[PDB]
Tab-separated table of C-alpha atoms (C1' of nucleotides) in Angstrom:
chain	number	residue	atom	x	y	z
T	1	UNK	CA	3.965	11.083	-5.743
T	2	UNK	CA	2.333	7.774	-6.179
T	3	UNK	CA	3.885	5.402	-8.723
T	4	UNK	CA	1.503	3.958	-11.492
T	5	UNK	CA	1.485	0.546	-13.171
T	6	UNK	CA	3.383	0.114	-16.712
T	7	UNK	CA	1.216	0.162	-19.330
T	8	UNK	CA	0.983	-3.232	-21.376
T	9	UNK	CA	0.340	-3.723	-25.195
T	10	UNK	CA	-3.052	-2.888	-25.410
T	11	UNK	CA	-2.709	-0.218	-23.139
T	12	UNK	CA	-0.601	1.559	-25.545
T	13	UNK	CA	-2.147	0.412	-28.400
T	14	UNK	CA	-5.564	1.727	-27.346
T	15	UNK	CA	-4.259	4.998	-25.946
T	16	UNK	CA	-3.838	5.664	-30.076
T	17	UNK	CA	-6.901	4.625	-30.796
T	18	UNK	CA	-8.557	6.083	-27.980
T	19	UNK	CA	-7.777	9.598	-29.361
T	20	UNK	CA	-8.274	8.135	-33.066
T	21	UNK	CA	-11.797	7.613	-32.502
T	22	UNK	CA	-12.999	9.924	-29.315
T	23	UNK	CA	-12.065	12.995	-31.117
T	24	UNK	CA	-13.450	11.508	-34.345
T	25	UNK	CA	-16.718	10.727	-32.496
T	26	UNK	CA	-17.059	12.369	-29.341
T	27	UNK	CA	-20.235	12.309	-26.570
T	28	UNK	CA	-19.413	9.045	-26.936
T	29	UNK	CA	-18.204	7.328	-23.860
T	30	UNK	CA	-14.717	5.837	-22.981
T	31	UNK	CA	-16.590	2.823	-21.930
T	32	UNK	CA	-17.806	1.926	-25.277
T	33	UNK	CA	-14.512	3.387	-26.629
T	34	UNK	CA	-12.381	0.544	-24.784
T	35	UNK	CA	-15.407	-2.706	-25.757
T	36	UNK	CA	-14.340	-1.406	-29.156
T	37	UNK	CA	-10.605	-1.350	-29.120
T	38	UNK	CA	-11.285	-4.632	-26.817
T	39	UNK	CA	-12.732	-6.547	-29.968
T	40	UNK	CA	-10.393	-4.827	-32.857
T	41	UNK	CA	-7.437	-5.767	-30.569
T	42	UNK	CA	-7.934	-9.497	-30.125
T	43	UNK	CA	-8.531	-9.442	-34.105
T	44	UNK	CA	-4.994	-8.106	-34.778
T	45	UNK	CA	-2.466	-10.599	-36.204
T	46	UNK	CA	0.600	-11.402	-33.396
T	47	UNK	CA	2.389	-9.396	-36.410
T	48	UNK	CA	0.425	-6.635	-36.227
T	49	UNK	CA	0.553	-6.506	-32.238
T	50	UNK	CA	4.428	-7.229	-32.597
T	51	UNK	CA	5.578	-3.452	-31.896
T	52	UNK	CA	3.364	-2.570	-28.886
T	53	UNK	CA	4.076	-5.947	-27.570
T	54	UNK	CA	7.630	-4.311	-28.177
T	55	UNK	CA	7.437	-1.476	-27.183
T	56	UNK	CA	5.501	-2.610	-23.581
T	57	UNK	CA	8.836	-4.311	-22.859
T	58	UNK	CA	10.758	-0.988	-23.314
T	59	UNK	CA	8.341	0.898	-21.280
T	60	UNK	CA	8.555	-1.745	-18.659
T	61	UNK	CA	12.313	-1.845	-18.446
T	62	UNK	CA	12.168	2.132	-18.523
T	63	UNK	CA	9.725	1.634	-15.197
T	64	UNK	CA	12.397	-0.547	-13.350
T	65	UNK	CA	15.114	1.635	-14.252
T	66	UNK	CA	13.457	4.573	-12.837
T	67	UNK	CA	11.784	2.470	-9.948
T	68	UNK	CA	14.457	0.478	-8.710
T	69	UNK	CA	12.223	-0.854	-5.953
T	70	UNK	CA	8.549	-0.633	-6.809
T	71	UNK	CA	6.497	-3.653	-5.924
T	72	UNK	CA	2.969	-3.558	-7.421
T	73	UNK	CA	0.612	-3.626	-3.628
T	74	UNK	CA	-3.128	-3.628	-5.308
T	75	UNK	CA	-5.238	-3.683	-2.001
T	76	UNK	CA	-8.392	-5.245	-1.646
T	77	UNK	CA	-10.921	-2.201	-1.370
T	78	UNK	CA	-13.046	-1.628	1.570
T	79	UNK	CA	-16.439	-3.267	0.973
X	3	UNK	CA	-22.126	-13.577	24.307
X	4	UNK	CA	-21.967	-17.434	22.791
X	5	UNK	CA	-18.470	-18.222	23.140
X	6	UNK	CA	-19.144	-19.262	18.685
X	7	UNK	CA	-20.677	-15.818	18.431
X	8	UNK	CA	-17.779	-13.913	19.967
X	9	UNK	CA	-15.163	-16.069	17.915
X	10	UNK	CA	-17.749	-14.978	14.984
X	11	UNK	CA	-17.721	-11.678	15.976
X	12	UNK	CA	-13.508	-11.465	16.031
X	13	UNK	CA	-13.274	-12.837	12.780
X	14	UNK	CA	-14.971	-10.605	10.965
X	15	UNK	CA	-14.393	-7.878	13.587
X	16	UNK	CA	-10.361	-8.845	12.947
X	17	UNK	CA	-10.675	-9.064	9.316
X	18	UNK	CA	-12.314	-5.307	8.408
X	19	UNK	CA	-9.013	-4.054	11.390
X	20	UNK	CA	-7.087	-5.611	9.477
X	21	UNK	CA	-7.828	-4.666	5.817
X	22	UNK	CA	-8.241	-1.197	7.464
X	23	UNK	CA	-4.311	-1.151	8.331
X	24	UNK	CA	-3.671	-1.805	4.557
X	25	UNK	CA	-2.171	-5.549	5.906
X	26	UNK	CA	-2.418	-8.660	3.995
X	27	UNK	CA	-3.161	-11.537	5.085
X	28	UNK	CA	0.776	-12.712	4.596
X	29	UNK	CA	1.896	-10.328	6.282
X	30	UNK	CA	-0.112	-10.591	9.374
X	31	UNK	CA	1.371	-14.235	9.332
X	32	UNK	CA	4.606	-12.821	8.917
X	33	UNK	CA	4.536	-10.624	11.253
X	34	UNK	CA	3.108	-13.385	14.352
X	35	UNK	CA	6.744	-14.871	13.114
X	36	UNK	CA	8.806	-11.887	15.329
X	37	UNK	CA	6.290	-12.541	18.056
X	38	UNK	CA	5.476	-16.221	18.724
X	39	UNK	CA	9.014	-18.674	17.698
X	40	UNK	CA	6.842	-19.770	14.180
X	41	UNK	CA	5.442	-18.349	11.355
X	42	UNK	CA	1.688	-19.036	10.658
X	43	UNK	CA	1.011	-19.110	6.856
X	44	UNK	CA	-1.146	-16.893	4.604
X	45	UNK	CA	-3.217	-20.353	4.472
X	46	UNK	CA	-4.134	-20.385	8.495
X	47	UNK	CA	-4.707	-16.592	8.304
X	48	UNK	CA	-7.719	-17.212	5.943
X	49	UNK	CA	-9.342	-20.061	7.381
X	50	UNK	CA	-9.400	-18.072	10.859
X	51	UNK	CA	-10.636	-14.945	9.315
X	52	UNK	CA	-13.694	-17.837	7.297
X	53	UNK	CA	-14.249	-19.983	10.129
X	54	UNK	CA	-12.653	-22.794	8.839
X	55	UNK	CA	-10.793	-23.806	11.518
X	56	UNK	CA	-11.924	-26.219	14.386
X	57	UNK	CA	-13.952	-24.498	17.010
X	58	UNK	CA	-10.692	-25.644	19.068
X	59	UNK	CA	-7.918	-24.081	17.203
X	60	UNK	CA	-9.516	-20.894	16.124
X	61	UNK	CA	-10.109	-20.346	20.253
X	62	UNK	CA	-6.219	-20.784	20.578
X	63	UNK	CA	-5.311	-18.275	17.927
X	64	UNK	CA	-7.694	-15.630	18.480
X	65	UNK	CA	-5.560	-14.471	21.628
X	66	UNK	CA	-2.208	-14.194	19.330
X	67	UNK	CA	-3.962	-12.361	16.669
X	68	UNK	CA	-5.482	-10.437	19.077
X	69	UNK	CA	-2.756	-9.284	20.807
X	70	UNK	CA	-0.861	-8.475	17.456
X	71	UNK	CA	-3.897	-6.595	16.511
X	72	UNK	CA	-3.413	-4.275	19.333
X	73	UNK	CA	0.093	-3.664	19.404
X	74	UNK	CA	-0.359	-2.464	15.805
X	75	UNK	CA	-3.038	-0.728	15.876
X	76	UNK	CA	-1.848	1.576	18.636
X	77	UNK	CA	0.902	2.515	15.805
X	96	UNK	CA	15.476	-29.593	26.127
X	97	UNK	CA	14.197	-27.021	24.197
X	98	UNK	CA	11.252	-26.655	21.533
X	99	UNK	CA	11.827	-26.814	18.085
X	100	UNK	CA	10.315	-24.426	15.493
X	101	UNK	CA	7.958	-26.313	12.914
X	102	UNK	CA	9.745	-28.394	10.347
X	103	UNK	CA	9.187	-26.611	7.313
X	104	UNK	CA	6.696	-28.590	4.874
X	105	UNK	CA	8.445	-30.245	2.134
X	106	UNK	CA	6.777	-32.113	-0.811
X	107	UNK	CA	7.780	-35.693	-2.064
X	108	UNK	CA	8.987	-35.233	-5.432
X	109	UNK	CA	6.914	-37.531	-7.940
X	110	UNK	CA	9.139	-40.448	-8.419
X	111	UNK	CA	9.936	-41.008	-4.315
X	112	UNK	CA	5.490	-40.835	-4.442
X	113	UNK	CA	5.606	-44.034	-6.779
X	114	UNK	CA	8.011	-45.664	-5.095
X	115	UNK	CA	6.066	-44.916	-1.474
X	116	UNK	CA	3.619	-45.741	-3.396
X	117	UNK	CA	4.294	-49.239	-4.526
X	118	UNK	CA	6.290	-50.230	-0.677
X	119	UNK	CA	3.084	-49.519	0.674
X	120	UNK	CA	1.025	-51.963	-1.209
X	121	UNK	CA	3.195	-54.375	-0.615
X	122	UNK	CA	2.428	-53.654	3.314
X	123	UNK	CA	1.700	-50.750	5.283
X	124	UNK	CA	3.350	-51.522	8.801
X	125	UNK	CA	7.283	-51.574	8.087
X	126	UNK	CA	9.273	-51.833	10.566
X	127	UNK	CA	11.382	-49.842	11.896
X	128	UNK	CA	14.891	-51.229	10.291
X	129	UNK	CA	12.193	-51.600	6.974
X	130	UNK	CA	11.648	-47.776	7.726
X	131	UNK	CA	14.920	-47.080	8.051
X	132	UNK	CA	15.864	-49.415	4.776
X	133	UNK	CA	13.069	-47.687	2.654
X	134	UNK	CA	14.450	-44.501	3.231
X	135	UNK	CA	18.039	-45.574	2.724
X	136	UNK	CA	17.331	-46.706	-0.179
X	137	UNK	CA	14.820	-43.339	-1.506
X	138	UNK	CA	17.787	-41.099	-0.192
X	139	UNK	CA	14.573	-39.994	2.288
X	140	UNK	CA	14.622	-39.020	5.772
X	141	UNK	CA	13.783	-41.985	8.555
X	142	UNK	CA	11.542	-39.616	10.231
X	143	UNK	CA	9.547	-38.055	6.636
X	144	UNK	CA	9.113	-42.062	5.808
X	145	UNK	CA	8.247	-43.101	8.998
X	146	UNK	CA	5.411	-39.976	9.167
X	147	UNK	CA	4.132	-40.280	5.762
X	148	UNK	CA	3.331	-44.104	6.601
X	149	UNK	CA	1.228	-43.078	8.977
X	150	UNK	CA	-0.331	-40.560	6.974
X	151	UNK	CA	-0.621	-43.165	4.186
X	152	UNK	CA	-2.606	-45.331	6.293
X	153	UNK	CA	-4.839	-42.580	7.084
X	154	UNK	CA	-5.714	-41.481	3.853
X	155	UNK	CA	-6.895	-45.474	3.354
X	156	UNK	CA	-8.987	-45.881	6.143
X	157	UNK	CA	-11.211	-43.139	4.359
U	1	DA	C1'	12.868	-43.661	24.606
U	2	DT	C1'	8.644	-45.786	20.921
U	3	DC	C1'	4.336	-45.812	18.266
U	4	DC	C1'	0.169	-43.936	17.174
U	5	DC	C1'	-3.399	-40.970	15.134
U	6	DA	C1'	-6.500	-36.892	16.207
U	7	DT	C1'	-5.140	-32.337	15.284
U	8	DT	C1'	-3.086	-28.635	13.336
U	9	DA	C1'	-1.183	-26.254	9.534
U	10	DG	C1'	1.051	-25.035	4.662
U	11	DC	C1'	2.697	-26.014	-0.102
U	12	DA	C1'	0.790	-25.752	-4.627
U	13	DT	C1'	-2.490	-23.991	-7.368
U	14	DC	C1'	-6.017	-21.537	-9.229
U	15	DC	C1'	-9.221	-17.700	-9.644
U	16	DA	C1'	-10.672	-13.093	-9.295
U	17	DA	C1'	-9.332	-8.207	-7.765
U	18	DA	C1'	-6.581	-4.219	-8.878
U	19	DC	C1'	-4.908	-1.125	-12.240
U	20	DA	C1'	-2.638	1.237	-16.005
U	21	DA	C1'	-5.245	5.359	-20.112
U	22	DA	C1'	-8.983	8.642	-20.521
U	23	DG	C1'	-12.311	11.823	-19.159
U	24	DA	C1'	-17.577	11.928	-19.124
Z	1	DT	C1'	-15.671	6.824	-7.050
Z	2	DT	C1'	-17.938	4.618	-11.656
Z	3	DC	C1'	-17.989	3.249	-16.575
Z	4	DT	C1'	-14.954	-0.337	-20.128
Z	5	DT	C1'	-11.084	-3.042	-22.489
Z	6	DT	C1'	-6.471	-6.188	-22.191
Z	7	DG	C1'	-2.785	-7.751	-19.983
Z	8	DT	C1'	-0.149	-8.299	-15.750
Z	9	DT	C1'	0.527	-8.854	-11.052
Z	10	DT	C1'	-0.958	-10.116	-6.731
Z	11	DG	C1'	-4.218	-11.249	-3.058
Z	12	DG	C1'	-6.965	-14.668	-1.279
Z	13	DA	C1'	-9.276	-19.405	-1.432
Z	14	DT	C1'	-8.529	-24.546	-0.947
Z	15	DG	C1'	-7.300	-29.479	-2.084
Z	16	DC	C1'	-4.376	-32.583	-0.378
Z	17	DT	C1'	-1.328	-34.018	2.939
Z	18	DA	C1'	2.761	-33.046	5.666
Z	19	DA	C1'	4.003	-32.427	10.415
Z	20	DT	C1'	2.843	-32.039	15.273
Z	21	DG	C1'	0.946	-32.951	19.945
Z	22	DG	C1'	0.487	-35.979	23.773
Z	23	DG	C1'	-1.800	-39.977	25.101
Z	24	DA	C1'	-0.506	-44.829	25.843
DNA sequence: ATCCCATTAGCATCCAAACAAAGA
DNA sequence: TTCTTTGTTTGGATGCTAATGGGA
């Protein structure tokens, strides 16, 4: 199988909110889901963005640990 | 069949070949190391695959990239290139000032400057020259 | 040898692409 | 594939200039 990026703060932060809000208000898309997490995220307080931040690093050291060798290799789409 | 439109044409031709083989363009460069007895840089990669080379040197590296090309798609002595080293900012000043002061040194006056920036005769000697090029302009 | 400077070529740097999540 | 966000990493672009070629 393929091997996926980490997941950063937001990432993790918005994959609660996601739910939190798409369930809450569905036929609504993920597109305007994510503009909206985007904005409520850059209000949060570095206190309140403290424990994703913290947990990101744990979920990034889990990745190495089981991925000894990955190397993120985006390539540049044919177009 | 414009010997610019053909060197146009490999470019681009080159370029889509090459993304197609998932290759970057550091690799590529890497890879002409095996081949040729030098590395050529991400940088020279993507000037030849812009045209931003001179009409001259693009004509002289279309045959190596060429060839490379091929062989992966199917699946008293020279030196190689001093590597390119920057002058730290302090050794610029000083360079800097010696060259006001004149910019033909001599030899010994080479050889003294450097002595004296813990700088290589040769590295001096070049950047002089370089120095006086970057004036006349 | 030297020395000279038109050419060639890359370090440093910076910007924009890719991508995780999710599932319409 | 796209549609969207942030954050992170990496690819690719590019100034400046270092280093080379080879003539004389």
């Amino acid at each position: 199988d393929r091997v996926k990026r980490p997941m950063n703060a937001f990432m993790v932060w918005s994959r609660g909110q996601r739910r939190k809000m798409a369930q809450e208000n569905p036929k609504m898309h993920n597109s305007e889901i994510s503009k909206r997490l985007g904005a409520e995220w850059k209000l949060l307080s570095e206190t309140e963005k403290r424990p994703f931040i913290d947990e990101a690093k744990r979920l990034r050291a889990l990745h190495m640990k089981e991925h000894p060798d990955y190397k993120y290799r985006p390539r540049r789409k044919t177009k | 069949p414009s010997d610019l439109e053909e060197l146009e044409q490999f470019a681009k031709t080159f370029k889509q070949r090459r993304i197609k083989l998932g290759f970057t363009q550091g690799d590529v460069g890497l890879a002409m190391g095996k081949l040729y007895g030098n590395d050529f840089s991400q940088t020279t990669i993507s000037r030849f695959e812009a045209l931003n080379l001179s009409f001259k040197n693009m004509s002289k590296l279309k045959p190596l990239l060429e060839k490379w090309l091929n062989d992966a798609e199917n699946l008293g002595l020279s030196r190689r290139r001093k590597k390119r080293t920057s002058i730290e900012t302090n050794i610029r000043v000083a360079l800097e000032k010696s060259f006001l002061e004149n910019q033909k040194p001599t030899s010994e006056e080479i050889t003294m400057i450097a002595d004296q920036l813990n700088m290589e005769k040769e590295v001096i000697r070049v950047w002089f020259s370089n120095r006086r090029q970057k004036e006349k302009r």
